[PDB]
C-alpha cells in the first residue's frame, strides 16, 4: 500500500544510542518502541547512505526503510566545497526510496530529515529513470512529505530536482527522437506551462541565414536533419526594460564527428552532445516556475554533425556572424563553431551577464572527470557567485584558466583569423575556451564545460546510471540568489 | 621543525612492462623534473642563507622492462604497511612517492611539498599554462599562489575530493590500486592515491608534467626542458622565512 | 549471533500459496506461523535468486533470510544442458549467505533445499573472496547445514566447492607471490593433506634440461624467475600397476607476451595464465580427499613469459622433447610451446586417458565467452563423459572441432616442422588445438581451452567478481564417475 522512509543519525560519543530524526522518534512512539527494538535486534548500526527494511510495524506502513544520515551536525565541508549534511540526506533518501521501489510499492512518505529540500531532492532525483521506450518497467512511485510542517522547503526540492530530471530526459532520449525541432518543441511546452510571461521562437534555417551565422550553418549542412536556433524569453522583472541575464547552450543533437569521424566505441553517448542546451533551458524553466523577478534570455543553436557529400571538410574557412574567419581544421571541434555565432548574437540583448554551457571537450573529462564542472570566466565576481551556489546544491564547479597563453595557440592560423583546434594537443579545454573568448566582448562572461559531468555510473549516489543533467540545480540556485 | 620537499626522480621512464610508445619517448629523460626542481630550490634557498630549516627527499631510479621488472597485477607493500596493486607499471611515480611521503613524516615537518612530472592527464588539463596544485590546506595554496604572481611561473589549484579517492581504493587485491577504475581525471586520481600516504595538515602536491618543456610559450626560455616552477618555489621559501 | 537461510519455491498453478521447503515449513511452525504471516505482509512473492530478510522471528535466529528457489520440479534443461534445479539452489543460497555476511553475522545455518550438495556449493562458492592482502575485510562466515539429515550430501558439496575455491585462490593471487616454485609448494601441501597415498616432485631446471624439454625452456629463459615442472601422483587404485589417468596443465604464472609484448590494458589478468595448472591440480586434490580408487598423474610445466636480453625471439626454432622442431613466430603463443613438452612426457606413463587444460587463446573467449569451456578431443567416448559430468555440475563444456583442415595451417612452416601460430588469424583456438595434436599419439586425449571462463563478473550468480576456478567441479565429477 504505502511505504515509509525514516532517517537515523550516527551515534555521537556521549550518546547512548544513535538518534532518530523527529519523525523517526515519533514513529517509534506510535508503535510503542517497536522500531527501536527491532533495529537493535537486527545488528550493526546504520552508517551514512546505508538502509535496512522492517516489516509489519504498523498496519498503514507494512514496509519501513530506515536510512543512515551520518553525523547530525555536518555543515559546510572545507575540503569538499559543499554542504556535507545535505549530501548525506540526498544519498540516504534516494537509497531508501529505491528499496521501496524494488518492493513494488506505488507510494512512499519521506522523513524531512531536518532539511526537507534535500530530502525531496534525494527522492525525486533518486527515483528517476528514462524508460519510455521499454516494455519492462519498474513501478511508478509517488513520493510525498511525511508530515505537514515545512511544505515549502519540500516543494522547493521537488522543483529543483524536476528541473534536473528534465535535462536528464532530454539528454538520455535517442537522437532519432530528440532532433533539433523536437528538443525545441519540448522546451517550448515546458517553459509555457511554467509561466505565461514567456516568448519562444524556434528560428528556422532561413532566419539563421539572415543572421549571417555561417559558422553554425557549416556544421548543420552535413546532415539531412534541419537545424533550428532556439530563442526563449522569460520576462520576470517588474521593469520590462531591465537588461536580461543571457544563457547560451551547445545543442548538437548527435555528434558523429563529421568527416573527422569518431571511433565506434561508446559513440551512442553522443546523443547527449546537446547537454549544454538541456541544462540552461531546464534552468530557465525552473526559474520561470519559481517566478523569479528577473528577465532571462536563453539561446540554443541546434543541429546534427554528420558525414556526407555536403559536410564540412577539414581546412574549410567559414565566416562568423561578427565577420571573423575560422579555419575548420577538425570537423569534430564543432561546438565552438556553433557557439561562436550564438555568443555573437547574445550581445544584441545588451545583457547583464553571459553564461554558456557545453559538453565541449574530451580534455575536460580527462582534466576533472565527474568531480566538478569546469568554469572559465573573465569575472571573479561571477566565478564567486557560481561557486557559492554550488556549495549549496552539491553539484560542484571548479575554475579553469582564461589566459592569453591559450589564445595564442588558436590565433596562430594558416588561412584565417582563428583556428578551430590548437597548434598542440595540450590543454584542450583551455584552448577551446580561448577560442570562444574571441567571440565575446562582455565584462561578465562564464563558459561551463560539462563534458565530464555528462553521465553518471555511480559517482553521485542519488543518480541512477545514465545522463546526469548536471549542473542544472547550481544554475537555478545562482539565478535565485541573483534575484535577491 | 623543517619544511620538507619531496621529488619524483625517475631518471628514465620507458613505462616498464606496460611499455610506452616510441614517439617522443626521449623526453622521458626529464621524468626526474620533480627532483630537479625541489633540489634546485633548496640550493638557491641555501645560497640566500634563508633562516629556515629545510629537508629535501628524492627517490631516484629508472623504470625499465626486463626479466625481473614489475608485472601488472603484482602487489607491493609500502613503508607504512599499505598494500598497492600495480595494475599499470607506467604509473610508477605514485609508487616511489608513496614511500618518500611516508618517510617525510619522520621529520615532523611544518609543511610537506612534493613535485612530480606525474600524469599525461595534467598536460591535457592545463598544458604549460600553469603547474597543477592539489592541497589539503588553503593557507598553503594561497602562499604558493601569491609567490607565483611575483615570479610569473604560474600555479593553478586542482581538486582533492573524496570522489577521486573512491576510484583508487576500490581495489580487487589490495588496499589501493595504482590506476583508477576509469580513465577520467587522471591527475586527480593520482593525487588521491598520494593522499593515502599523507596524514599531515599542510601538504601540497605539484604535478609539473605540463610545464616540463618549452617550445615557445614562455618567451624568455629557449626550446627544451623548462625547469619550472623553480623560482615560484624559491619565492615561497623566501616569503616564508620573513 | 547465528543466521538462517530458508528456501521457498515459486507457486504452481493449482497451489494457493508458494510452498516452503521442509525446513522452511518446520521453522514457520516453530514460530507459530509468524514466518508465513510476515512474508505475506512484506509484498510480492520471491522469484528465483531473490531474497528477503526478516528480523526477530526467533531468539536464536535474529536474522532470517528467505530465498527464492524457482520451480520445485526443475530437472535437466534440454536447452541449457544442465540441471536447472541445482543451478537455482546454488544461486539462491549464495545470495542468502551474502546478505547474512553484509549483516556482519559470523555464522549461518543453511536449508538443504531438497539437494544438500547444491546448497553447500552455493554457500561455499558464494561466500568466497580472496582478501589476504587487504586491511579492510568482510566478516568471516561459517556456514553449516541446518538439520542432521543428509550430512554426506552437504559435505560432498563443501568438498567440490572447496576444490574450485583453491583454484580461484591460486589464480587470483598476484604473480610476484604466486611464482612457479610457490604454486608447486602450495599444491604439494594441499595434496599431501588430502591423502598419504601421494608423491610430489617439484622438478628443477636441470631435470627439465635432462628431459630435453627445449620448447618449455625457450619460454622460461626470458625471465629471472626459475621454472619448475610439477609432477604429482595419486595412487588410489587397489592395483598399483593399474594405468593412470593423466592430467596436464599450462602453468604460466605471468604472461607479458615476451618480445611479442601485450598491450597494457587489463594485462594484470595474466597473473591467471596458470589457470590450466590450477584447475587440474585442484581436481586431483579433491579426488584424493574423496579417496577415489583410481591412479592419477598430474603434470604442470610452470614459468613466466617475460621480455629481456635472453628472451625468445620471433623466428627462433626450438626442439621439443620428441624431436619435432617449432618455429616461434609469436612469443605470446607460449602455452602451446610449454604444453608440447608436457604432453610428450605424459605418454611415458602409458595412461588410460590424457586431459590437458589451458587458458590458451583469446580466440576461445571470442568464440564462447564464459558460457562454456571449449573441448577438443579425438574421442567421442571421452567427450561424452565430460559432457555428462558438466550437466550435473552446471560448469558447462562445449565441443570444438579437431579437423586436419586446421593442422594444415600449422604444419605449413617456413623453417621447421610446425609453426606456433597459424598462417591466418581465423579459428585461433582450433589451430592452437591442432598444434597440440602434433604432440599427441594417444587414442583418448581431450584439450580444454578455459581462456573464456577464466574470470567472472556476474555471469555465474554464485561466484563473486574475480577469477572463477572453472571448470574444476566438472573435472572432479568426471573422475568420480570414472572410478565407478
Ligand atoms: C567528449 C565529447 C564531449 C566531445 C565533444 N562532443 C566534441 O564536440 O566532439
Ligand atoms: C607524460 C609523463 C609525465 C608520464 C609520466 N612519466 C608517467 O609516469 O608515465
Ligand atoms: C587471453 C589469454 C588467455 C591469452 C593467452 N595467455 C596467450 O598465451 O597469450
Ligand atoms: Zn538526447
Ligand atoms: Zn565533436
Ligand atoms: Zn560535440
Ligand atoms: Zn610512467
Ligand atoms: Zn613517470
Ligand atoms: Zn596467480
Ligand atoms: Zn601468451
Ligand atoms: Zn598465455
Curated annotation (Swiss-Prot), chains A, C:
UniProt note on regulation of activity: Zofenoprilat inhibits Cys-Gly hydrolysis activity.
Source species, domain of life: Eukaryota
GO biological process: proteolysis
GO CC entries: cytoplasm; mitochondrion
Phosphoserine, modified sites: 10, 22, 148, 162, 206
Positions carrying N6-succinyllysine: 13, 29, 71, 423, 444, 457
Name the record gives this protein: Cytosol aminopeptidase
Species, as recorded: Bos taurus
